[PDB]
Write a protein that binds this ligand. Sequence first.
Ligand SMILES: Nc1ncnc2c1c(C#Cc1nc3ccccc3[nH]1)cn2[C@@H]1O[C@H](CSCC[C@H](N)C(=O)O)[C@@H](O)[C@H]1O
Length: 278
Amino acid sequence: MDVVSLDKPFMYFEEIDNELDYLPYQGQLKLLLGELFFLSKLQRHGILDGATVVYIGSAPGTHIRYLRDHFYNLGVIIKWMLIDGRHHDPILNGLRDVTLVTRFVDEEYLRSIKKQLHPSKIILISDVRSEPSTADLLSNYALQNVMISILNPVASSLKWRCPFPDQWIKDFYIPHGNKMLQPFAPSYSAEMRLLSIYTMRLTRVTKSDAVNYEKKMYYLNKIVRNKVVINFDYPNQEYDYFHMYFMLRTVYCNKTFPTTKAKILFLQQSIFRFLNIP
Ligand SMILES: Nc1ncnc2c1c(C#Cc1nc3ccccc3[nH]1)cn2[C@@H]1O[C@H](CSCC[C@H](N)C(=O)O)[C@@H](O)[C@H]1O
């Protein structure tokens, strides 16, 4: 891995500044970090407390247990509602504050869960997916807009991977938000998480945006993520660990540590141990 000297990683897609012509249970780690990042940002904004997290497409959702235990141990009052047609990981069983729902959501069912949660704050996390086609994605993203227009969450994190330019169909619309980059994504994934705080204006996505995404993400996965951050004071200086480190320092802990590095190391250790990563 070519060596590089960096002050910070790319945290949002907008920050990628160049382009190029296109672990065990790593998937749970990718979800866990981005959702710890998203929910920790909401905690900083004082809006996570008293909210209800509605996670659609949450199964098996092994990592969600770590998320709940994290905020439960910080004293943050959160109710979870995990909805999926598939059965969740049994490690999510027996938690009074976690509600498991075995159902594929449609418009009608989004209306009813809104009814039963209103007027409580809703935080939406979506990871629904139906290799997928461009029509599958357009259906998925429409459904996610339908989640926002009906559930009207105070914040959302949405699965967001633009369709490839060579499989384009039609321009579509997605919510405004920051496009959060995911460490420990698959080697050449172009998926981000669309993070939005609502104070919902939609954005047109065009075929040129699909070209910009494909090239920016390829540069990120070929060049950026294969670097060693040699100034990085950490047991592992590979970029994805550099990237994970900067996400993890937005996380709160009841425990006190002598240094920030000691805090990130403890958190990473905790996360890997629960996910059974060496
Ligand atoms: N409507 C839904 N509601 C809820 N969950 C849904 C869906 C959905 C769909 C659909 C669909 N196709 C249609 C075709 C025609 C008409 C209407 C249609 N509607 C898929 N999923 C779940 O998304 C997960 C992705 S992996 C997450 C991984 C997870 N985040 C983890 O932590 O491991 C899977 O577990 C899957 O079961």
